[PDB]
Symmetry: none
């Protein structure tokens, strides 16, 4: 098997002399064939903050990673890397990674404090932002890397386990693993897009930490996978939180298309920053369009049932409340775990979590109302248990009263009394 | 490889127009092909306890799971499911599962508090006993599911290392994994019973928890495998606590019979509840003989 | 897959009638085909301590392990093992290991206090020095075993997990695990179609996994040496979540440097042991990659962090010989920094948990930390030379001794970087503040 140089949201040349090296929420990096050399261009979306620049590549960089403080470049064959800080205050630096026979650099990543290099033999070389080496580690062959601050999300491949992932932190003291080569349930690729899968065998369109620090991956099945409870090894689950193919279908008014595609950039709380690609090819082109936003949706929608109700896609309030309930539940659980362990990063997480818990109960109360409407006392009671706020429990009682369900009211009041008794302890 | 819809102790149609959807210590569920539709029958072994019933299946369910409180039905292609409580006091509910192109429901399971659906793409959708969704999880492709109270025992298939199993609790706190895609020591299948191995490629005749909460599996090699000490990841062993081929041979005085086969229902502490099949086929037909027991 | 009888640094017969059963820092065990029987010879490197002897093998032992107090022999097929103490105090003893249909003994190991037998079905049978059996354990199929005192490093293989390793201690009552079947990131052999006529094909038929040897270091750290000829050491094995496999020696690279930057095809390394910072080995000269008869005198190869690049090495040598491969002091300082950092981290964990064993480790660690700061100060100087105040400060933070911080300040003063000096002095103050809290 042949390992290929990976970079987040990178595109292949195809029939052109240009492609994108890497791409995320910060900006995009492209490279153009200049006779015998290359012309690399580093661009940004926040034009105010950073200044777009370009330089001549005499090495043929095929690996790249972009963050808010700098850009990392890599040559998969010669093993030469270069880190270029965005500001001119900090100097560029260059190293050459030792490569054995047939060994290739497969993926690189960088944070403001760390520089990461992974190879096909499983060499994990790490540095600080200045190029000072920390320790050389031997792991499974690495196929994709991403990082955030001091933490690293790595994807490995072999002939045995197939695809696996590791989650680690490169602290000031030592390297610690949260997860070590656990199964990665991302669907592998199974033609006009053949150029892409020769360029990207795994079909990993991109991978990244969320804005709140949760590992995410976006495969050829165009489904965003988020890792839940990664801090508790026995509770770790991969969650499909967005079927982009479905959203496009819904945006297209229930029509099947073959010319609209999603290119993942990042995940900010509940929104997928991306590029909407219009054309036959699934990867973005020149010039790069303006980034779009796609709110995440739990894969609980059925096309047939959606079509029936329309007779952009309109969603029935009952069905939408169920998805909103699940979505809120997941996001709430995740954000709480974040605050319970790592604290705040942006300054609005507490406010977000509060509104998130609010949306949870509101959507849950809608389902509760429908259950009362259908005289389903049992299902309604189960929904009431899942309520968070005591004010929502109160609201549930009043809804039950309007529905004239006295048997339900007493049992919900039993819940309230029980929680009030826990308050006494 | 072909992902065929699985259910515990389920039998194929064959040349007949009827089969068993699923079958355990509680009862047996049949389906009969009519002019255009199907007729599903839910029968029990303790007639004094549950009321047998039947209905017209307009959807063509090929997935079923049975417990002491209700029956779960599933359609592998349209992704439709239906849960029917045994008691009339509780209402039936129907729900459709999202399915991508070529994605099929491969196995369903239910307890008095949980409803489980697994697909060939590794989607793990869980609900309570009323249909309220709890979480959608992405795992390895699921081929077989079974559950008991809050615990779940799933069998998965990898292109690379074949069959694996997971064990987890879907408690009110969070899904906790005891075992995550560890090796499944079960022996794959090596004819008259060729219809069966097309119906079930993985040869897993049935699977269930014991009365004391241990995952059991019954393979094509007809050996009841028991997972002991799964709470202790270091000491976990699979134990062949019953070779049914030996026990039949001993019942026959010491002669090799080719017209007797064991069909697993459950494991109740000390005995294996089963169905002794008399015929050329390894799977029971109509009528269903009285349940037997095999001392461990 | 077919499991083959493994022994540390064992060689195959190949196209000869003799080979080595096992090989380490203590000595070597060879066997010669004697018509219908075999002639086993046990030799030592410290000729003063032990006396070389030999005996006739009517069983056909293909498994062996050597320690300082005795030698263990094993027959992979019959399951017969024999432990022969070097000294006459304790008698030799023999047992027969129960083997099911097709079950083979795959690896044996022995310390002065423990004897271990591993099978192809994953049976882990252990005994004391007198042959008193412990509890029998069922694990993954074992491919390689090594042990030291009461601790065992075992390598397992399956079709599922692939290659894994376990780290354990054989207490007085029962077996306790430090690590249980975690991933073993050793590169497997890559065999072509031209290799079917290669002279070294016989080795990979004899040793499919390509494990040339495995052992605990002199300080008790697990090491393995695969077909990629790279020494892997397991760091932080006491802390499961911090466990790392570290490549600390590319022997192919060292030979290249020893050959003055010339590519060779006739020099190979055969691993014996790891002593602190030095790899004890046999330098094999010839077409085959394994040693033959007569055996050369053992060589020493100091470990080097794989951070050197051939192209950059050649370039610097042209400017040196214009004025064996010569290494530029700036480039050499980085490797020495990394190497010292690793060795220091390891030895510290060793002393903090197991204490001393030889009696001079604290002196060793002390000099080691000294070498650490000294090499680190060279990088700091170069950083100051390039006016790179940021890079210098990052380097300054990694300094250990406060006296080294002082050294950094004086270097900064000589470089006329007053802003750096103040910031380095802030470190001294900060460390003073953390010590009081």
């Amino acid at each position: 098997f042949r390992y290929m140089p990976f970079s987040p949201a990178g595109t292949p040349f195809g029939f052109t002399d240009r492609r994108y090296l890497t791409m995320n929420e910060v900006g995009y990096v492209s490279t153009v064939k200049n006779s015998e050399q290359y012309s690399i261009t580093v661009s940004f979306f926040d034009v105010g903050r950073f200044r777009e620049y370009h330089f001549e590549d005499l090495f043929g960089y095929d690996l790249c990673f972009l963050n808010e403080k700098g850009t990392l470049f890599g040559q998969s064959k010669t093993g030469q890397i270069q880190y270029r800080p965005h500001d001119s205050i900090h100097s560029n630096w260059t190293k050459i990674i030792p490569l054995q026979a047939g060994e290739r650099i497969t993926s690189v990543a960088a944070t403001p404090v760390r520089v990461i290099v992974g190879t096909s033999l499983g060499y994990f070389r790490s540095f600080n932002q200045f190029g000072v080496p920390f320790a050389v580690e031997k792991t499974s062959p690495i196929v994709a890397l991403t990082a955030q601050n001091y933490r690293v999300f790595s994807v490995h491949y072999s002939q045995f386990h197939g695809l696996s992932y590791s989650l680690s932190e490169l602290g000031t003291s030592s390297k610690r693993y949260y997860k070590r080569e656990c199964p990665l349930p991302m669907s592998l690729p199974n033609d006009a897009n053949l150029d892409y899968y020769n360029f990207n065998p795994m079909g990993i369109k991109s991978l990244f930490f969320s804005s709140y620090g949760d590992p995410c991956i976006f495969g050829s099945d165009n489904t965003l996978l988020l890792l839940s409870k990664w801090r508790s090894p026995e509770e770790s689950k991969w969650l499909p939180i967005l079927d982009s193919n479905m959203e496009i279908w819904k945006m297209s008014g229930g029509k099947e298309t073959t010319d609209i595609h999603v290119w993942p950039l990042a995940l900010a709380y509940d929104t997928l920053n991306c590029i909407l690609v219009k054309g036959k090819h699934i990867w973005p082109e020149f010039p790069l369009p303006l980034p779009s936003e796609m709110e995440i949706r739990m894969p609980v929608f059925v096309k047939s049932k959606l079509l029936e109700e329309n007779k952009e896609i309109q969603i029935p309030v009952s069905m939408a409340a169920e998805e909103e309930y699940l979505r809120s539940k997941v996001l709430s659980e995740l954000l709480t775990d974040t605050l319970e362990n790592d604290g705040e990063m942006y300054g609005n997480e507490n406010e977000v979590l509060a509104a998130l818990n609010g949306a949870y109960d509101k959507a849950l109360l809608r389902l509760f109302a429908s259950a009362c409407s259908d005289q389903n006392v049992e299902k309604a009671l189960s929904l009431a248990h899942e309520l968070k706020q005591d004010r929502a429990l109160t609201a549930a009682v009043k809804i039950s009263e309007r529905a004239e369900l006295p048997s339900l009211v007493k049992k919900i009041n039993n819940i309230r009394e029980a929680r009030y008794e826990q308050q006494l302890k």
